[PDB]
Amino acid sequence: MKDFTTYLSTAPVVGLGWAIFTSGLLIEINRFFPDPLVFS
Amino acid sequence: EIGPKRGSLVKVLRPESYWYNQVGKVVSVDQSGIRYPVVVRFENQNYAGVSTNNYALDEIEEVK
Amino acid sequence: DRPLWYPGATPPAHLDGSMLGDYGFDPLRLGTNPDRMKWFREAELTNGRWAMAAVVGILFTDVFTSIGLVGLPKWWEAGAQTYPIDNQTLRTLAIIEFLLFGWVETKRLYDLRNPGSQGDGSFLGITDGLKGTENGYPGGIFDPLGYSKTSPEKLDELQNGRLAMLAFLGFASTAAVNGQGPIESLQTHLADPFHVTFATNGVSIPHFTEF
Amino acid sequence: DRPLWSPGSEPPAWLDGSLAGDYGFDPLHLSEEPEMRKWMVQAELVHCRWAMLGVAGILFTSIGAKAGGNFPDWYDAGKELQKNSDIPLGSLIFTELLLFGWVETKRLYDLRNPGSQGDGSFLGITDGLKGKENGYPGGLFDPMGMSKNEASFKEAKQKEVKNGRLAMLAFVGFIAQHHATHKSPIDNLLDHVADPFHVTFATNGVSI
Amino acid sequence: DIAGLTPCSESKAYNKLERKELKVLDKRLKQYEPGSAPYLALQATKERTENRFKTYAKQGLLCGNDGLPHLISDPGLALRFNHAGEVFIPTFGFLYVAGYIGHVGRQYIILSKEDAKPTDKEIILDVPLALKLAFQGWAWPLASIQELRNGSLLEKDENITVS
Amino acid sequence: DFLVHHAIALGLHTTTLILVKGALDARGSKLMPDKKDFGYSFPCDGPGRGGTCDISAYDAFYLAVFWMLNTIGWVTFYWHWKHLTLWQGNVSQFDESSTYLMGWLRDYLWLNSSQLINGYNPFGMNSLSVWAWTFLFGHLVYATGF
Amino acid sequence: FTIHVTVLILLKGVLFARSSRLIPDKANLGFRFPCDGPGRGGTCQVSAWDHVFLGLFWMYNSLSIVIFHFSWKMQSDVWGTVTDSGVSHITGGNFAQSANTINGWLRDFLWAQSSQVIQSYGSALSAYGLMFLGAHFVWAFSLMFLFSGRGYWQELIESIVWAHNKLRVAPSIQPRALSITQGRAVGVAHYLLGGIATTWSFFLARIIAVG
Ligand code: CHL
Ligand code: CLA
Ligand code: CLA
Ligand code: CLA
Ligand SMILES: CC(=C/C=C/C=C(C)/C=C/C=C(C)/C=C/[C@@]12O[C@]1(C)C[C@@H](O)CC2(C)C)/C=C/C=C(C)/C=C/[C@@]12O[C@]1(C)C[C@@H](O)CC2(C)C
Ligand SMILES: CC1=C(C/C=C(\C)CCC[C@H](C)CCC[C@H](C)CCCC(C)C)C(=O)c2ccccc2C1=O
Ligand code: SF4
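^ inputs. structure came back:
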């Protein structure tokens, strides 16, 4: 398990988790709050 | 003793070198009158892949 | 060191040393370098001291307002009530506020840089009174009540000052989604606590679940 | 030296047998490290203790509903009780989230640092509010002296876990045989006792 | 107004563009039945489109002769004519986020280089350390000016040159 | 017109980068501390040191010409279309369609290449046949350089 | 013509892989190597790997016309709607007259059949209009890698490393420009992807919107 967690700490695996976060965050912020252009 | 101490870090002053104004460990020093006795080892590789090079007394100076 | 903001196991690194209102609260480690920790300390005071004297104008007056003794306006619309008055003082107030503070504050700015640095003949004749005991705690400004040896009445100055800094942040936020004053917001939480809150009525969260 | 989940299988090296409810069951090699093992035993117990506390609430109401009392199904109970309540939703949530953040956070820092909450900061309480073990506190959460004996405390830990594993399996049952029958658990029981051979999962019209 | 631009509320082409984009959906909506899912999907798109147009008008935007909204960049005209949310304010919303990424990556680089084998720490990250710095960077402008005024931000002629 | 004047700025600042670099790093680089001994134009220093293809200052000028032509192309495409809409009377063509790149491909290139391409049709030939022939002649010479 | 040539590039690489007159010892250098050196007037792209890298460009030029042959022939002479009086083909049977000229391939195939792709904005085929453009970007983007060389880029990174070094934010993994063979591979990849994806958009949008 120590080696499994180490594999998960590699660059591409951590980058995958980053991408799902930043992408899912932006999408759900466009799912709700649709079409922002001017900021109030 | 002719030159810097074993295991001592020194800064390079060859303008040609990849390691210029950079620091490296002194691996050894020869006291037989050679022109470039001081052997130095760096962690970072050069463009070819070599991490050591023999420098001179005047070309090296104290760290930082 | 006074007690810890977490009761349990949050070791601070540089706050074990003496300082006022030390509760070991610096997660972001913005007070590592001592030179700028010395600067942020004075910032907590000028914000603390200023915020408290400000909160009274919102608090001491609105209590008298809700009871009905005086008919003063609320802080969220006190500014638009002054200038329409016939005898008014239209906005040369922003600049005079800066010309007057600019004289005092730079005298305070040059004190932190050079402590006790007020020359002999610089001011008319009161050059001696302007010297301070410490940074942030000068001598000749207070007339009584600063000769004790256990000087930490200062802890009261901070715990009261940090508290007021929360007040104005709550006044400004309450007065942006509730639409009413601070005391009017209090009379409602007492009359109907569960209905008037930041969750359901005060739109601080998008809660629309009608079922 | 002890029973196991599958007789004859070599137990893992890290499961020595001291923990409560240890039968050598960890094929995924989880809790192989000490720190994760220290975290999971506390996760198992809260998932257990909440199951017992909750499942008993379902049986009490579903029995009172079958007897005649005015109790609804455990499902669609939060929907019909909020329609006619003086407490709006949102004021009830963040009364729960805010109050649990106190407890759930104090329990965390006893985990990361045992004996840390017994400093006396919280209302001058020192002897209590310091952990006897990882997931087993005492002093204040054990008013009756039912833990000051290692002989009777070690087997009680085995009963807390055995009646707990069973309990949070039952909650998975309620979810499953509700979606199939859309009836209460007790009603499904009396049907099986009435005609055991005919009314089973095979004849519910689902799962086939 | 400014620059010979009309507000989007008063413009005719702006409303012309609304009547056009809705007419496409109404024609597309005729094919399907009322209670079907394609009908619900198009009605939602109709609801979003009606909301997009009214919100841009309510926000004091400026529409040109073509009928599309235009943005203004000078903070002077933006603040004078109440168009600050367009460009001027998002400028500070980005730079807070961008400097967050620099202050974080700069700290992970410095701290891993203080230990043995920093090359392994780049390809195999120390996730506990990375999350620690990522939640400590909320106040990166304070640390920058702290590090600039101190002088430990920049290196001083200990860098490689070429001649 | 706003987006193009900024896209033109991309050309001048990056074209200058390629040429400025080939000048200042003409005397020497860390990869080649003595370029000055070889000359302005030499092929390379070999596959050693990871590869040394296109280091000389001649090879910087060589790469900048591709950007010179790209930059002047944007500058010149912007002149022609903005003036055609003026001469045709329909200025709204440029204002609405020049904001997205399919407008350049649809309304400027694809559209105005109709009379040209029909210079020599299978039915007959107009006076623009010499230009359509040259129009391919350049589409060919360009490819032979590849 | 395109086939006998594509064989020449690959078959030459095979037979001359082990040895040649210019380089009697290639086998010791290996399968993929960029060059022996500038000597002999130049020995760039002499390996067998670099023959494959060239053959892909000719495979592309070959099948791209096998595909255009299938589209224009079948649209003009085969496909179409049958009416009471014969068949009405899609392009009116213009393969016989226009195809003999190269301008015909430019006029009647490219300029004409690109109307469905270009006018796809605002419809369900809008994705093909974007892929049609993005495929051109990735194609031209490849030209940086094929035309240029590793030398210019490794020097540029040094001036960039200075700034990253000046701010004490530099990678312990030193940045190095791509190898020679990699720049060639990266080129043909982004090249073929952009060349092939353009047809994939030009065709499906043309044919789904029939005619
Ligand atoms: C030649 C240029 C000169 C400049 C640029 C400054 C700049 C400064 N001095 Mg001097 N000083 C200068 C000359 C001199 N200073 C002094 C003596 C001092 C002292 C003793 C002090 C300063 C301070 C200051 C600061 C004042 C900031 C401020 O409040 O400004 C904003 C602008 C103003 C204050 C001007 C306002 C206009 C005004 C005077 C109008 C007067 C009419 C009345 C208002 C009418 C009454 C109406 C009633 C109803 C209100 C600033 C750093 C202070 C400081 O920070 O020290 C560290 C300070 O304590 N200066 C002398 C005599 C030796 C000078 C001789 O040339
Ligand atoms: C720190 C002092 C303080 C106090 C006493 C109050 C009190 C109150 N706020 Mg308030 N508020 C504060 C700060 C404070 N606020 C700050 C700093 C903000 C900005 C984040 C807000 C934002 C806010 C909104 C948006 C709303 C209220 C509302 C209310 C009222 C109903 C309770 C509620 O919604 O939960 C309060 C919810 C919070 C998130 C703040 C609680 C957290 C504080 C910091 C804990 C402090 C501990 C303890 C209470 C201190 C005791 C002090 C006491 C003995 C004097 C009540 C009078 C509601 C209203 O409409 O009033 C009728 C409402 O809609 N508040
Ligand atoms: C399954 C197939 C597969 C694929 C598609 C990749 C793809 C990649 N690997 Mg890789 N890898 C694989 C299997 C694979 N690997 C296996 C089996 C191992 C053995 C465990 C490794 C071990 C490995 C190491 C040790 C490293 C990579 C790295 C990389 C990346 C190259 C660096 C780069 O161009 O970004 C350059 C990036 C920057 C200059 C700045 C950071 C911004 C990035 C792009 C954001 C994160 C991207 C994210 C990972 C994308 C999601 C994953 C994607 C494939 C869907 C690239 C994304 C390197 C890396 O750092 O990955 C990010 C690296 O150091 N790989
Ligand atoms: C979330 C609840 C939970 C948690 C945290 C644990 C935790 C633990 N159990 Mg435990 N257990 C549970 C539920 C749980 N159990 C249930 C319900 C049963 C009865 C079926 C058991 C029966 C059991 C035995 C017999 C033994 C353990 C053991 C252990 C320990 C060894 C490491 C391990 O596997 O844990 C790591 C656990 C997790 C990371 C949780 C993962 C949860 C997954 C993602 C859910 C999978 C869904 C599942 C496939 C479908 C559910 C429906 C199903 C009922 C049809 C550890 C303390 C062993 C031990 O050392 O004793 C102390 C041991 O011998 N457990
Ligand atoms: C099955 C379960 C349930 C937790 C279950 C969690 C539980 C039971 C807590 C539930 C909350 C409750 C019951 C409250 C409910 C109510 O509030 C409402 C919602 C509705 C109201 O009507 C009534 C009341 C009661 C008020 C746990 C499952 C975990 C398992 C099997 C883990 C397996 C592993 O770890 C090991 C063992 C080792 C490996 O070999 C296999 C793996 C996979 C690696
Ligand atoms: C450009 C170029 C380079 C430089 C190219 C490099 C250094 C490759 C750059 C790879 C980057 C780092 C990949 C990542 C790119 C983006 C950051 C990915 C987007 C990620 C965001 C979404 C976060 C060469 O080294 C070269 C060598 C030989 C012949 C031609 C060339 C050549 O043309
Ligand atoms: S690096 Fe360039 S110049 Fe040198 S041998 Fe290879 S192709 Fe020839």
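The interface with chain C takes residues 32 of chain A (CB under 8 Å). The two ends of chain A are 49 Å apart (CA to CA).
thumbs up if we can close this ticket
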